[PDB]
Structure formats: C-alpha cells, structure tokens
Amino acid sequence: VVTEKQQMLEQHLQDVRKRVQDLEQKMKVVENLQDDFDFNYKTLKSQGSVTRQKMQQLEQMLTALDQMRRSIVSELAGLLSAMEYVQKTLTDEELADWKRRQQIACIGGPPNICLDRLENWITSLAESQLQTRQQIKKLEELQQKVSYKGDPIVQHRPMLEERIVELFRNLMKSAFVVERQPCMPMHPDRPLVIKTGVQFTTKVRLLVKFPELNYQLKIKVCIDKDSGDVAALRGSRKFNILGTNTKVMNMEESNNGSLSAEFKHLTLREQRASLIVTEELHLITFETEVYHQGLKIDLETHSLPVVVISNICQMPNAWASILWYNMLTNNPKNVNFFTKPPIGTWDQVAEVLSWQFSSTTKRGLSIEQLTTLAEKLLGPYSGCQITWAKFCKENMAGKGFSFWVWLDNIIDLVKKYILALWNEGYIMGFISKERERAILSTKPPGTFLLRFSESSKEGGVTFTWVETQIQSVEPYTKQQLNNMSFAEIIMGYKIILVSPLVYLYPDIPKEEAFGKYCRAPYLKTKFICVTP
Amino acid sequence: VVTEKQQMLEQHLQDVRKRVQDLEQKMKVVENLQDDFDFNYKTLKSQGDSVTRQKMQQLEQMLTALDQMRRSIVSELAGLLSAMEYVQKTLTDEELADWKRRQQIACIGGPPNICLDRLENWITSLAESQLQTRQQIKKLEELQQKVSYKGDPIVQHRPMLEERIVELFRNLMKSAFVVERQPCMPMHPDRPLVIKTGVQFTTKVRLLVKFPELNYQLKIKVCIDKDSGDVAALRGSRKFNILGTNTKVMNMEESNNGSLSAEFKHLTLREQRCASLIVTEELHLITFETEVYHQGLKIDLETHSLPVVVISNICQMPNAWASILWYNMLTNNPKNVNFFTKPPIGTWDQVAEVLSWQFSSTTKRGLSIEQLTTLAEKLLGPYSGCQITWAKFCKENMAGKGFSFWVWLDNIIDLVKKYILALWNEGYIMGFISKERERAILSTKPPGTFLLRFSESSKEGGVTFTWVEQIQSVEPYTKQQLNNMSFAEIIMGYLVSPLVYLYPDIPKEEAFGKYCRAPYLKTKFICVTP
DNA sequence: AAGATTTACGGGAAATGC
DNA sequence: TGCATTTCCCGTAAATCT
C-alpha cells in the first residue's frame, strides 16, 4: 500500500542515518588526531633541528585539526536542516494523514490504521538525532581540551545543540498518540460515545520506540481538563473519570515491543442556550512527563471529541453526531462544532451511510438501492447538500422522527434478526413505490421483494405478492419478531384457506434462497397468523 | 376485634390514671396543711418576746395529721407502683409481643392486623401516668426538705419509690421503640425482608410514647451487621454496609395521627468485600439506635429488624423469599440468624396456609383446599399432620425434576401476576390437579369440557388445558411466547377445531369472552391444532 | 405544562470466586 | 473443573429538571 512520497521519506531517512554514520567516523578521526596532538605537544614541553621539525608537525597537526572541526561543524548543520525538513514531513504530513484515517476508521471506513511504519520512521529519526546530539556533546568535550582563537566549536556549537534539542523535543511530543479512541467494549461499532456508569477503554502509544523507557512513564487520563471557560462555552455539563486514572506505559504483550498504555474499566460520572446533550462534546486528555538524557519533556494528547450520554436510548442521535463530525472536519478538538454544523454533500453522506451496514455486516448498499434513500432526503444526487437538520436534528416530512434515527433502527434490525438474510443480496429493502411497481409489470404473479417500512419508528420489514393488485402486510414489530424469523415467516406465509408467493425478484424460486435460513406426550406447537 | 383481656388492660389502665389523680389531690391537701403548719409554727416563734397554749396544741395536732397523710400517701404510691409494674408486663410482654408476631404473619401475606394505634394509646397513657407519679415523688422529697422528724416515711421510703418508677419508665421507653415497617424494596412490596445490593429499600420506626416535646428531638441511626463477626456470631458470613443517608430525625410529620416516627428512604446495601450457609439462607440484622434525654434521665433506645436476606441479583429472590417464608412461618424469635443451620420442620397445615397467602396477596383469592391438596400429594404421595422439611420444600429438587417445589411454585405465582390475574381467581382456573383426578372430566362430562391447569414439566411456568376426541393438551406456551397473546385469547383463539365448556357446565364465550379482544393488512396469530 | 434528560432496576449474560 | 455468586448493562419505566 506504499506511495511515491512515502518511498522518498523512507529514502531520506536512510540518508540521515548515513550522514550520522559518516559523521561519527569523522569524529573518531578528529579525536585521535587531537589525542596525538596533545601527546606530541606535551612531549615537546617535557623536552624543555630535530626538535625544530617536531614543532613543525605540531603546527601542521593543529591546522588539520581546525580544518576537521570546520568540516564537521559545517556538516552537522547541514544535517540539522535536513532532519528539520524531513521531520515536518513525518509529523505534519504522514502522521497527520494517519490521524484522519483514524477518524474514517471509527465511523466505518477503510481501516488503514497501522502505525508500524510510522513508528519505524519516527524511531529511526529519533535514533539519528540522539546520536547527532552525542556528537555535539563530543565536540564540546574536545574544545574544553584544545581551543584557539577562531575555533568553530566555540562559535557554532551552541546553535547546533539548540536545534537538535528542539527537534527531538518536538518529535517526542508528536509521537505520543491515541491508538484506540475511547469506546465501550459493549458497543464496538460506536466509539467516541460513552454512557455514564458503563465502562470504556482507550489506548495510547509513544511511537519513539525506546526500551529504556519501559515501565518508566505514567500516563494520567482525564476529562474536561480545560473547561470552565479555559477556551470557551460556559453552559455545558462537566464529568469526571472514575476507576483507575493513571497507568504505566510498557512494552507488554509483545505486539512488537511498542510502548503503550491501555486504560480499561474507566467510567464517566456527571459532576453536578448551549446544546442538547447529544451534540455536546468533551475531550479525554492524556498526559505524562519524560526525563531522558538531560531533558524534561512534557507530553500531552487527547481523544477525538466524545459525546457523553446517560441512557442507551440516546445513542442513535449521539452516533449521528459522531458521524457528522468525523465525516466533515479534520480538526481534532472542535467542541463547538454543533453550534454551526457544516453542511455535507450527498457523496460524503452516502459513503458513510453504506459503511454503517458495511461494518455492522458484510456488504453495504448498492448505489441503486441507496439512491432510494437519496429521494427521501430531497426530491427527484452528487452535489446535493445535506444539512445537519435534514439528516438528524429535525424530523423528516411529517413523520414523527429523524432520517438518521429511522435509518439506524433498520441497521439494528439487520443485526438483531436478519444479518445473513440481509447481505446474501436478498434484500432490496429500500425502494420507492413508483419503482416498486415495476416488478409485476415485468414479472409473473408470486414475484416478491424484501423491503423496509417507512411508516415506523424502530423498524419493520415488508414484502410484495399478488391477486393483479400489488399488496403487502402490517410490518411485524421486533417485539413480535422475536418468535419467528422473517425468512421463516416469508416461507411460512400463506393466504384455513391458505397459499403465498414464489420468486425473489428477479427469477429465483423461493425455497433455494430462503430454505437455508428456514428451520401421550402433549403436542408440538409452531405458528403463523398469515392472513385473516 | 377487641378481646377479653384487652378490655381488662384498658380497664386497668384507666384505674392507674384514677389512682394518680386521687393521689394528686392528696398531695395538694398535704402540701396546704404543711404550709399552714409552717405559718403557725413561725407565728409562735415570733410570739417568744391559755392563748399561746392552745396554739401549741394545734401545731402539735397539725403535725400528727401531716405524718398520717404522708404515711397514707407513701403507702398508696407503693401500691400503684406494683400495679403499674404488673400492668406493664402485660402491655409489653403480651400485647406488644403479639403485635410483633402479627407483623411476621403480615409480611409473608397473612391477616394484616398490624395497627399500633391501640398499643400506642395504652403505652402513652401508662407513660403519662408514670411521669406524673414521679413528679409526685419529687414533691414528697421537696416536702421533707422543708419539714422532717424522726420516723418520717418520706425519709424511709422515698428512694425506693423513685427507684421503681424510674426503672419502669425507662423500660417502657425501651419497649416502645419499634420497627413499624420492615425493610423492603419499594419495587417488591410483596417480598419484604429481602434486599438486593444497589437497589433501594425503605424502613420505618416509631416511638409509641406519644410525647410532643420530643418532636424533632431524636436522631435515629440505622445500620447493618453491627455487633456481628463474633459476639456469639457465626464466622465466615458476608458483611455489608448501608449507604445513603443513615441517620434521620424522628418527627410527628404527615399528621397520620401525630405519632413519633422516622422513616428511612433511599437506603442501599453494599457488600463490604474484604461458606457456612448459601447466601439465600444467610441472615442479617438492620438495627436502629438513639438516645433520649428527658426530665433528668438518659435512656438508650435500640431495636432491630426481622432477619433479612441480602441478594445481589434478582434471580436469587425466589429462594430468598422461601427462606423468609420458612423463618417467619416457624419462629417467633426476632434475631435468630443461625436459623438455617438447623432449620425447623413445618406441618402441612402451617405450609398450606402460607402457600395460599402467596396467591391470596399477589391476587384476590387463595387456593381452594381441593386444588391445594393436589400440591399436597406432590410433596409426599397419598395430610393434616404431615411434616414438611426445608429440603422437601426448597433446599433440594423434587424427585426427577431438576428444580425445587417452591421455585416451581413461585414461578406459577409470577405467571398469574404477569399474564392472567383476572383469569386467575375468577374460579376460572383449577390449575393444580393430578391426572388420575383430571381424568374425571370427560368420564362425567360431554366432549369439549375443559380445564385450566399448570405445567409440572417446566421451570418458570406453563399453562395448559383439556382437549378431547383422545384426552389431549399442548406444549405449554412459555412466558416469552406468552407476551404476544393472552391465554384466554389463545383458548378462544384455538381446517381448525377446539373445546366448549369450562368444567363443570359453563359455555366458552361467557367466561372467556370478557378477557378476549391500500392500508396493508391487520394480522394476529393463532397456532391452533397443527 | 411539556419536553428534555437522567435515574431506577429487571433480567439475561458474562465474569469471577471457590 | 463445575458450581455458586456477583457484576455488567440494555431497555423500559419512572422520576427529575427546565
């Protein structure tokens, strides 16, 4: 899955390693010569024509020494610029892309979430810098021993040290990331939504892969760390994290030795204009401090915005808010997003809509079948704008409920009662009556369709059969649906004066598609209302 | 609902009031005469600076009459103390103790004569009488400070009189502090003395000494497992704490009748984490305490609940309830937590009463002896004196089945509440009958005569009926199944064909019809024969 | 008042103790 | 191990806030 630019980054990183290596060798040469210069110098003073040519050699050794410092110092600076320039591609371009991909993952997109490459690049670069700094320290030690007027260690060394410290210090900061966003174990498909009292899990990783830090750092987690008007908005609820809020970062489980810290069993408790709870947003923040080779570096990171709810019947509106947010911004910390919520093109929405099915189950929605829903948002499809109100905030067109609330419930019906049946391709599910009409027009009596109810909150399932004159039945509710499967009821259906339907549109007979999902001493009992 | 003995107690209490009244009057007479004696005495001393002769005779005679009146009073005070002493024990050890038993029978579903109004009246009447008697004894003391002589019966008797009356009042105060409502979860009103951890329960105490000066004076502290973990107590049981607000002020509020009480709501139980008995039989006590300071005295009051079983999931309740049934059916001991190490043996009489109550208080009618007797055979096999053991009843399964007699029964009770209360206790269900005696329907009656019967082949419950050709019946519809259609609806709902008469002679739709009952197509289902 | 939001708690399920 | 007991947490209902 590699890209043009990624191949250059990896190339520039091996380059940086090469230069640190080349420079190391130069330091050994300069240091030996400086040893040699001292030993001869000391010998001459000890002495107190043959003698005269030794002074000429001392003289010449020194010239070469100064030449070698200049060379080194100059090449150190070149390396710093290159590291400086390559770091910004690492941190502001490749890392920042992985962060977006996290947002798209959470809501059900293509999960290229792997940090293995990034961690490798970053640790490669970190390794390179810490050695560069040990080289600068070396130069310093050398000037303490041997200096003169004009000495380029005296003149450049502090800048070199300053640049490298600042580099390492920011790379360390970028490397502390949230590997798994807060999520309830119980609702794996709806992260960034936390109900009070129920447990959620979150994980951080330091991508600077240093073994000497194993078990060294404690991470503290918390929520609303900078609230009470620290940035903005005075109105909102405030929570605390209960359970065990600090945890030690280690390499444990041996995934690949990565430094991480995983928080389990955390709960949220409420501390007791604006926005409805469903659109209100909070941040979970992680912190720590590293002390490494002379430096103290504070690390900090935070989660994506989370919505906190208190009953689970609030989740379907809460999830929409997560969908909408992560669909349309790349900003990690915009809690006031829902005061002025962005407006989303039909393209954006439709992708995301499919993902909801395509990650609770195996296939998404077919463009034609999804496009049925497209008419429902507007009226008789690429540049069309969808507004938060059209989507979730207000009800749709005289029904008592939301477009998304209604949709989500179907997405639940598939999971609870008909998952297999759903993506066998068996369900068309979404179709307008005008275009529903073109089955019996084209096909023989007993050709049927599987369709979802629009006249209902939560969900109902429906079907097309003939006597023609197209007919259909009162959608069986879930409370009803517990007892018999929809496939069982389809194949169980008849109109005791009985009989039913024959072909799942287009040409397939009934029992081949739907028979696989089909099923003194008193009297065994199983039933169907079928018709009156 | 008054009794012979109760009428005498009330009579003896009006008597005690009469004597305190009669004595009060005697104290006024003695005190006036003593005023008079002083004033004359003082006048004679004033004189020291025939007439003066006969005044000394009157002083002399006033004094004699004074001493006479003290003796009389002191003697009658003592008589009263004995009578109060004797009447208190009937109040406290006989009438109060009976109300306490009746509480136990109430909790498990018996006749609820639980009213404390009478008791509180008697006790407050007596308390009022004693505190006045003591103010009379104090008065006698004041009088001896003023006027005494050799032989004076206040000097000689007064301390005993004071000692007896203090001890009396002090114990009557202690008996009067009681638990009016036993701990119970609001959500399970019919199963008190069973508390699940985390869920709220409510309990109430009352001081039956009806004194208005104590309104808002006393703080009651509640708690659980106080003085447990080894002051005679069994080792290795669980220990809990009460969360929420564990003290509360006693007042006369709501004006029920002005009674002093303190009600605890919203309390929860939490295990104090960090083998003798299973949790369901393990017992704890909730204790209430306070201290009263009243007219010179400090009195500690204490009381406690009946034994409670603490559970943690609600699926534990039906064995927990049995334990409450068994305990309160068979002991009158308020604090026996080791009861279930050696549990008593219960006669079929005792059990059958209690069994009916469970239906008779979740719903309107109990069990008919005939229908109840079907269950009786199930405990033993082909009943007045027959003994039932805790193991037969609840601890072990009934032979062959994988579950308890009581667990199975309780579930049926639940079934009557959740799906068929009306249909139940209309007479409409016989419900419990042996096949041998089930057989005597179509033997006597015409084809389509049916019965309503409960399943034995099932944990939780099932409901069943008679269908004839071949006597027949169907796979009992489970409660899950039963959510969708009522049993009456399904009976009357039943190429199809069903039944005609609820045994004995009643047709179908008169008894069971009252509980019965483009644009797509409205549909409802009936399994029927198939 | 009605609408929003949170609390309460059964019941099945899973985890933990023993 | 299997069995006992407790925790977990949805989902409806009721309570509370606004």
From Swiss-Prot, chain B:
Mutagenesis / variant outcome for changing T245R: In ADMIO1; uncertain significance
Modification N6-acetyllysine occurs at: K445, K459, K514, K522
Stated consequence of mutating Q480R: In ADMIO1; uncertain significance
Motif Essential for nuclear import location, chain numbering: 15-27
Alphabetically ordered keywords of this record: Acetylation, Activator, Cytoplasm, Diabetes mellitus, Disease variant, DNA-binding, Dwarfism, Host-virus interaction, Nucleus, Phosphoprotein, SH2 domain, Transcription, Transcription regulation
Tissue: Heart, brain, placenta, lung, liver, skeletal muscle, kidney and pancreas. Expressed in naive CD4(+) T cells as well as T-helper Th17, Th1 and Th2 cells.
Posttranslational modification: Tyrosine phosphorylated upon stimulation with EGF. Tyrosine phosphorylated in response to constitutively activated FGFR1, FGFR2, FGFR3 and FGFR4. Activated through tyrosine phosphorylation by BMX. Tyrosine phosphorylated in response to IL6, IL11, LIF, CNTF, KITLG/SCF, CSF1, EGF, PDGF, IFN-alpha, LEP and OSM. Activated KIT promotes phosphorylation on tyrosine residues and subsequent translocation to the nucleus. Phosphorylated on serine upon DNA damage, probably by ATM or ATR.
Principal subcellular localisation of the protein: cytoplasm
Disease note: Hyper-IgE syndrome 1, autosomal dominant, with recurrent infections: A rare disorder of immunity and connective tissue characterized by immunodeficiency, chronic eosinophilia, distinctive coarse facial appearance, abnormal dentition, hyperextensibility of the joints, and bone fractures.
UniProt protein name: Signal transducer and activator of transcription 3
Source organism of the structure: Homo sapiens
Gene coding for it: STAT3
Residues of the full protein shown: 136 to 715 of 770
